[PDB]
Write a protein that binds this DNA or RNA. Structure first.
Lengths: 167, 186, 54, 158, 214
RNA sequence: GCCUCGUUAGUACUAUGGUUGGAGACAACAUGGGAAUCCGGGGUGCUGUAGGC
RNA sequence: UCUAGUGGGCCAUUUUUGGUAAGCAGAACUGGCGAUGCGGGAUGAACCGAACGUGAGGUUAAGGUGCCGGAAUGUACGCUCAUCAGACACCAGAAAAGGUGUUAGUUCGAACUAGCCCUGAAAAUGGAUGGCGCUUAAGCGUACUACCCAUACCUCACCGUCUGGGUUAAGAAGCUCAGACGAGUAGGCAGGCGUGGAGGUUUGUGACGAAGCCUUGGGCGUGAGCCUGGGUCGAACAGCCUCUAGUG
RNA sequence: GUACGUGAAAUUGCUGAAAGGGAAGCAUUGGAAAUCAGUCUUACGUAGGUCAGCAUCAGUUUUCGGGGGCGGAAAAAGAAUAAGGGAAGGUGGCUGUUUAUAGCCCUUGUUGUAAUACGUCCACUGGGGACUGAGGACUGCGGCUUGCCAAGGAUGCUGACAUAAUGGU
């Protein structure tokens, strides 16, 4: 169960840098500890800050403003493979950014055998215009959507007396 | 599983005398009670020295007791001397001063000289009556390393200890490794 | 196997790498001879002068 | 193997780059007393009085002083014990330990603080303490608004 | 007869009022952090909370296949056994000790409930080098009374707030002998807490683990 | 040329960790430590004793 | 201070040398096996977890929960169809390059790029994801719960060892209180059991059955052992304190 | 009974019992069958054999439920109700449009000190099950009101059988 965290931090002030800059990141992590770890992971690759010489100035858990509204999310990711030369854009339709990232992680692991360590999320954006939207996502956006219920295997109830109807 | 250095660690101590002397055990039994019913370090040390063995209880001498009790400042006065061991005579001193000694054993010469010249000889139980807490008592020890074994302990290169040799002479561990004329001296 | 140093550090630390006992006074012998000679005379006068003062 | 005195001393007894030539004379103008804690750094130019390569970088206490050398006592691990090694090392291969001088300076300061504390009737804690966790503090955002960062897309620089 | 009961009746109330004062201090500190955070949110700035001075460390690994340096440090931490817990005063020296033995122990920030129930249910004192349970205030007074620590609540206050006598209080407390966690560990126990394991620093998550072991 | 600061760069490298990935080569991640060249800016002796002016 | 055994090692992590390579030879650091059971990896000396007194209860580790087999034929999202698929680290082995196989991506229909499958792939008794079997899996990748259980952890009882504290009112060599702890080859030490003979002792047992022997009888001790009922038997034997040895 | 005191084991025959689908032996747990001791019966209402059931407690532990404090964007939402904005995967209407004969999205106000979820805490509380009962006059630390107490380790109320029932071999 991932969570979106706003992580704001800065390096500790020094004589060379009396007023260091505050940097903020939106990143998805199961808990605040991993969120701070990923923040230092991204800040370390870019802007010469350790965990030791820096500090987390703010931690916040962001919830979905509209968790009951269906939305389309376009996610840009960096994918590291056995070759490791990859950028991807994928689209997922659901009601929250957290769920879209979770569905992205499951889909990315299923289709490319990519792990949480291999994937870094470039950006998650809400696509509002239908024209801006993946073919499968568009054809879910079809106004006249209707389809039959897919198979769903329907206490212990072994040794049923009658053959199932399954329809 | 526990990360402990050593398990069930007895250190070194003796809890009772290895001697099967009935009278020594009677004295030990007295000083067991005295040590644990008084706060006297004297009684505890007497109990420990009763447990000690013959090599750990060297004999003390009349003159050594006189020497230690007549040390300028001293203030040994009439304070009783206590030694857990044998008091041997010293023939070399021709006059024995008036002394009071409590000891396990007095040699016949030492006891006669002490009584003939001045003071008194006491046993450790009589000391337990006069000074049950060991107050105003000069506790003394014999020279532990005056024993012949220590003349040999620690022998080695450039240690100046006595080698174990069957005879003394020019033929007995004196040539090679003992002088520069035969190879080296070690 | 002709040589190895595998179990040796373990054997060392079982009784520990023990340090020699520290003594306040080290031999003035085994030092410089001229200093040793004068320190004998300096010590001899010091103990006598302490005795005289006492 | 060869087991000479200066075996495998090519880099440790070598004089530093652009540091060759003549030894500075503040080395000879220094005074050493018994009890001084000194470092050994074998100067390769002076071959007389060179301690063995083990003692390069080793720190010990002075025990003897001669006309041109210093006796340094060093504890060397030999099997399962430290053994006292008394090397007669020339003063060129010797320098005073700044750690000892820092300690003596700290001792003088501590006595000074104790005297002023006694005079004022106060108690001063003279023990050093390790670095504590940071205190609670406010961080102002005025003219320092946070900049939201995203990981950069992968690209082939070369 | 009644002289003793009156004098101890006085002593017991001294314990009661100090316990009341300590609880008031806990409530005030908790409120102040909340209000300071609320002020920062309202004014748009950021309030960095005080970093923890107190750390609880649980030894999660057994006593087999350990390097000498980690084995030495855990011995210095008095973590001789698996599932053993200790309170630590957190500073620079301790931080780099826990860094070395991080693959072998987990640690975090204890809360008031964790400290209280650890000392109440698993509280044993080191009385004459013996593991004596803290079932009476006389036991704590006879050992820590020279530091004005007379009661269980005084010991809890010293441990929680890291008082001037924290070393004596911590060394008085026997290393807590915690049970196996009810509900289990994570799937893999010897990864770091960050990568899905249970070893390493876990910050506020040590409290749930301790309540699993209590 | 040399000396210093920044850049290089939290880069290369590295201690620890995994029943991580990969046939392997090797790589990623976790808790830590952390360079060097190129390049750009600044600098081009300071000071002690005894004296003379 | 005195002395034993040892002075054939081996494996793994990582670094590294000789070597075509090797279950090869050689080293460095640490951990192990040797000397070590237990849980797990079907099976294995060093792999994983955990190191062991006798037990009761609880809970976990590693690893697992279709059946063999204790434990969800659980949850969520996909991928895969294999004309001899795949199925868990070490590990008991396969590569380049392709495949109108298919699922997703990248950039201007074309190329690439990945994940799985197939091809490349090929032996000799009949047989091995351990087996049975398994295809919206009981295969693979990810996520989340519940569950199962080690001699590990926790509480408790008991044994022993060690340590600490009491005890002149209690074979004081006794009694009593508390805490920690418990693997082991070579080896060291300690306390005990058994055998023949000697001194002392017990108003000791014995032809109304000693010793010995047989026993699907009973009893004691962690054990070496000891006692006893019944049967046989016919001349001697034992307890305790010490001495001794051709003593198991 | 001279093949002669005692007469062991290996091994052998007979008898009784039992077991057995390509070894056997062993360990652990219980069943079955055979076998057997202890205990009891008494002693002084009192106490007493074996085995069960329940209650009230103590230790340990597991599993469900309720109530409350507090924290976050002083949750996000949402509902209801006032402004304005935008539109569609375009409804009534007429492919195109802007709430009408469906509605939706965005912002603000309000109802609001909203609720819930989550987190955390309660020296707040209700159940169910399991194992254990070490110690043996008095002391101690506490609560109550001197007595009492769930407070320095199980007692109480009963029943069945007194049996091979428990237990052992």
């Amino acid at each position: 169960a991932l969570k979106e965290y706003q992580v704001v931090g800065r390096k500790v002030p020094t004589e060379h840098e009396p007023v260091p800059k505050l940097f903020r990141m939106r990143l998805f992590a199961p808990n605040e500890s991993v969120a701070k770890s990923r923040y230092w992971y991204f800040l370390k690759m870019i802007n010469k800050v350790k965990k030791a010489t820096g500090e987390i100035v703010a931690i916040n858990e962001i919830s979905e403003p509209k968790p009951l509204k269906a939305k389309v999310f376009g996610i840009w990711i960096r994918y590291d493979s056995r070759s490791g030369t990859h950028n991807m854009y994928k689209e997922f339709r659901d009601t929250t950014r957290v769920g879209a990232v979770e569905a992205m992680y499951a889909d990315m692991a299923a289709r490319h055998r990519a792990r949480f360590r291999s994937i870094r999320i470039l950006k998650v954006v809400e696509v509002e215009k239908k024209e801006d939207v993946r073919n499968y996502v568009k054809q879910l956006l079809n106004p006249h959507l209707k389809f039959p219920l897919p198979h769903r295997r329907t206490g212990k109830k072994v040794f049923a007396p009658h053959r199932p109807s399954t329809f | 599983g526990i990360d402990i250095e050593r398990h069930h660690v007895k250190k070194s101590q003796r809890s009772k005398p290895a001697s099967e002397n009935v009278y020594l055990k009677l004295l030990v039994k007295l000083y067991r009670f005295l040590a644990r019913r008084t706060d006297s370090r004297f009684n505890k040390a007497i109990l420990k020295r009763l447990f000690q063995s013959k090599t750990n209880r060297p004999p003390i001498s009349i003159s050594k007791i006189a020497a230690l009790t007549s040390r300028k400042s001293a203030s040994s006065q009439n304070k009783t001397t206590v030694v857990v061991g044998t008091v041997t005579d010293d023939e070399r001193m021709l006059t024995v001063p008036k002394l009071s000694i409590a000891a396990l054993r007095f040699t016949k010469s030492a006891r006669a000289r002490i009584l003939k010249a001045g003071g008194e000889v006491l046993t450790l139980d009589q000391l337990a009556l006069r000074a049950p807490t060991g107050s105003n008592t000069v506790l003394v020890r014999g020279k532990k390393h005056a024993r012949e074994a220590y003349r040999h302990f620690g022998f080695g290169p450039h240690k100046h200890k006595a080698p174990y040799v069957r005879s003394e002479g020019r033929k007995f561990e004196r040539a090679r490794g003992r002088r520069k004329s035969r190879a080296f001296k070690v | 196997k002709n040589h190895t140093n595998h179990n040796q550090n373990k054997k060392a630390h079982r009784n520990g790498i023990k340090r020699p006992q520290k003594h306040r006074y080290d031999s003035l012998k085994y030092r410089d001879a001229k200093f040793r000679r004068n320190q004998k005379f300096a010590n001899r006068g010091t103990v006598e002068a302490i005795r005289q003062a006492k | 193997h060869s087991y000479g005195i200066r075996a495998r001393t090519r880099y440790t007894f070598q004089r530093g780059f652009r540091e060759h030539g003549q030894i500075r004379l503040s080395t000879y103008l220094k005074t050493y007393k018994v009890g001084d804690i000194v470092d050994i750094k074998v100067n390769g130019a002076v071959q007389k009085g060179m301690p063995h390569k083990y003692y390069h970088g080793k720190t010990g206490v002075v025990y003897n002083v001669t006309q041109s050398s210093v006796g340094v006592l060093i504890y060397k691990v030999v099997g399962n014990r430290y053994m006292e090694k008394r090397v007669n090392v020339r003063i060129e291969h010797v320098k005073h330990s700044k750690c000892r001088q820092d300690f003596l300076d700290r001792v003088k300061a501590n006595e000074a603080k104790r005297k002023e504390a006694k005079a004022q009737g106060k108690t001063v804690q003279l023990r050093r303490q390790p670095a504590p966790p940071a205190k609670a503090h406010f961080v102002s955002t005025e003219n320092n608004e946070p900049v939201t960062l995203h990981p950069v897309a992968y690209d082939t620089t070369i | 007869a009644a002289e003793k009961k009156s004098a101890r009746q006085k002593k017991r109330e001294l314990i009661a009022k100090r316990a009341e004062a300590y609880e008031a201090e806990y409530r005030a500190a908790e409120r102040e952090q909340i209000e300071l955070a609320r002020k920062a949110r309202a004014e748009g700035n950021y309030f960095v909370p005080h970093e923890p001075k107190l750390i609880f460390v649980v030894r999660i690994r057994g006593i087999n296949n350990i390097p000498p340096k980690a084995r030495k440090i855990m011995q210095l931490l008095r973590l001789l056994q698996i599932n053993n817990g200790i309170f630590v005063k957190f500073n620079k020296a301790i931080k780099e000790m826990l860094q070395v033995v991080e693959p072998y122990v987990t640690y975090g920030i204890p809360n008031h409930k964790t400290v209280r129930e650890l000392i109440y249910k698993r509280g044993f004192g080191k009385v004459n080098k013996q593991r004596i349970p803290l079932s009476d205030n006389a036991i704590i007074e006879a050992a820590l009374g020279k530091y004005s620590i007379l009661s269980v609540e005084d010991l809890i206050h010293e441990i929680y707030t890291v008082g001037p006598n924290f070393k004596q209080a911590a060394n008085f407390l026997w290393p807590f002998k915690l049970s196996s966690p009810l509900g289990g560990w994570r799937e893999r126990k010897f990864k770091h807490f960050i990568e899905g394991g249970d070893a390493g620093k876990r910050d506020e998550h040590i409290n749930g683990l301790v309540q699993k072991m209590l």
